[PDB]
Write a protein that binds this ligand. Sequence first.
Ligand code: NA
Ligand code: NA
Lengths: 415, 415
Amino acid sequence: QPETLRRYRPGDPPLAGSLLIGGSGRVAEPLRTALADDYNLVSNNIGGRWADSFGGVVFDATGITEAEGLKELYTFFTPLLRNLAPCARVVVVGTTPAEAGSVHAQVVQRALEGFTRSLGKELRRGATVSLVYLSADAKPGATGLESTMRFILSAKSAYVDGQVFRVGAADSTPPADWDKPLDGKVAVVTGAARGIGATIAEVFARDGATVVAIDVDGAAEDLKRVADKVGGTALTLDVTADDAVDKITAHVTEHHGGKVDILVNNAGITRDKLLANMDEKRWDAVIAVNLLAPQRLTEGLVGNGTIGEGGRVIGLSSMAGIAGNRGQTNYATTKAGMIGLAEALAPVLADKGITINAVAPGFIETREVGRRLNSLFQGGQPVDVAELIAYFASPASNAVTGNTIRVCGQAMLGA
Amino acid sequence: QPETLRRYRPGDPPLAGSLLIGGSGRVAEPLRTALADDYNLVSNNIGGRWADSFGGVVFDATGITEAEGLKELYTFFTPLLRNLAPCARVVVVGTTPAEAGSVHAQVVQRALEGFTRSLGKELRRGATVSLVYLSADAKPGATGLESTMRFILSAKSAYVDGQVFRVGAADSTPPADWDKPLDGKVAVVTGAARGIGATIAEVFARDGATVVAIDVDGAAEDLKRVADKVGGTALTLDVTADDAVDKITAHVTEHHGGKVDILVNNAGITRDKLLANMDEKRWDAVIAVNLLAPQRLTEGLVGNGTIGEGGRVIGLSSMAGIAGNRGQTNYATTKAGMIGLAEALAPVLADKGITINAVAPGFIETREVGRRLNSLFQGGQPVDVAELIAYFASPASNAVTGNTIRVCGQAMLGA
Ligand code: NA
Ligand code: NA
């Protein structure tokens, strides 16, 4: 039966249970130091005794350099698995494979993904698995991966499962309050009148952001209701219009101190048709809204300084973007394009202190096959998507860029 | 209903139908020049008139640099799709996205994968789709992609669908005979007594190779029958043994002129167990056969010069390696490791004129859900796997390295 997944409410501790950190790499110790105040840490012991079930288990694999060393995955995990709490979080931390140094080390660091993806398909009771790579050039403190670990090791990551997080080398500063990580940040969310966009606005406001909710004139009434509820502002506009950048800039200047800290390119349309039956308007409309507009809003707002130091851009990709979908050559192109925008702009935007990432939702309740064909045996909720976006949006997520991460419950579907 | 897929027999022309090449990039013209003798080329025309159905359609997208330019995918393909033959081949050729130059060009070159993967899910009557990227540093002749195009544009690629081929910058020479591309080459195939390994031996011999069929002492009778049939030799050994490299070297010295041109690391075992129920022997046995042995055979045979200039190493990955599988934390680790071996060794082996790639089969007939959940609505055949391996093995495939390609009929399952 599907598990009722633990999700986040304000003030919640990160885990329902303890956090065991082990492995003999470069991350275990500094991670213990970073997380000690906020998590109830326990250690491995040969007696196999722990008062509580584990809410999280983290294995530091960054020290493994030879295939024989992979046996520690077995020796470490096999005795721990029976003590996992429902919705526990299992995480392996490795070194970015291309940065692992030796050929043999790169092989084993790459091999870790076969292990984690498999373990995701074995965990019980809503528990999830994650793989996090950390650059070999990260400082001993490993502060750059803290926001990633705190997202994974919480209820917020409920529907993120089987995935790979790639942290670079930069140092990070915690937010003033990890429970209100977006305090003071101004967040523009397109397509925010309803659906996932409205939930993104809600989660962002929960986390302390001031939300600029954007949608089309035609959705003005719904948009106003969202903006009012979340304590933000409503901005009606067509993201494809030449003056969209100007209008956003004017709006944040009038209401929000002249800055956009977080841009979520969530607006999107479909004009589904088999390519054999495609026409010009159905092709162009989809490319205009879903690819040209996010490219223009991102480049235009960076280009006039509205998005600057500390900026966070998150694009919505999709399963069609990764795996393709019948009748969606237009839509899938745009959603693969949103991955391309993150991959291409990441190095360019780095120089200005801006990150850009992509989120690909799976099956989200907004049919029975889409719903059950994932490790969690259920569809996701809009909040689950919003949480992953809020993770990338964190001021403490400056060392995370050019990533595409799915929020899919470890769906079977992929590439 | 599933299509009866066209497959290759000796002497067959590459396509059942014509080959239309279009698009206004750097590949269309030199590709026409290269393929003119062996393919019946036709061109696009505004009248929409062609005597024959298309056996292949190639679109050169290497010139597309802006999202507006993606509309040419629509304008080019939509009028052609109704003239495809059964089992036709549709190919888009782009520029390696990171090499595309501008941010906008990288975005659109990356976006091409959403288009191709989607079109694969629309094509009828066993037709397939492929995306090929060519390095921006390839010479105008584009000879480095010829073997890739000839593999795709043939019956050999029957069960390869939805995939991405990445060609670097090197120039290539055709084999003396494209119909016997492995003539004179010595190919070692592990796990060759039965199953896919025996079919790899058969296909290699068909293509002109002299096969060294390797399997365990216990499979000696079956191994001898394969070696006799294919005109090769049988070498019984345990690939995990310290002297495996020595024994292979001695064998090829005695029978095959002292060289191994092609190494196929196909031998593999499973010891399926949930990680919670894992034990040391089930972990170690799988790592030894499936990861340590291919690493050692490859590094040892390169290291004593048995594999040298012109060498081709192909590892067998698997769906478990890419997507994970319940009960296979050990096996999946090794199969992800086989991808790692290709990724890690590619740059090191480049200096010695050796390529290394990985093949990940899907559902191959050797159950009904695995069988039908792909674009071709059927399981694959061992020959289909062998054909993809033989493509990487081609002497003309020197510009293809560090690739992992699935042979899965565009299976739903992935990452
Ligand atoms: Na603590
Ligand atoms: Na011709």
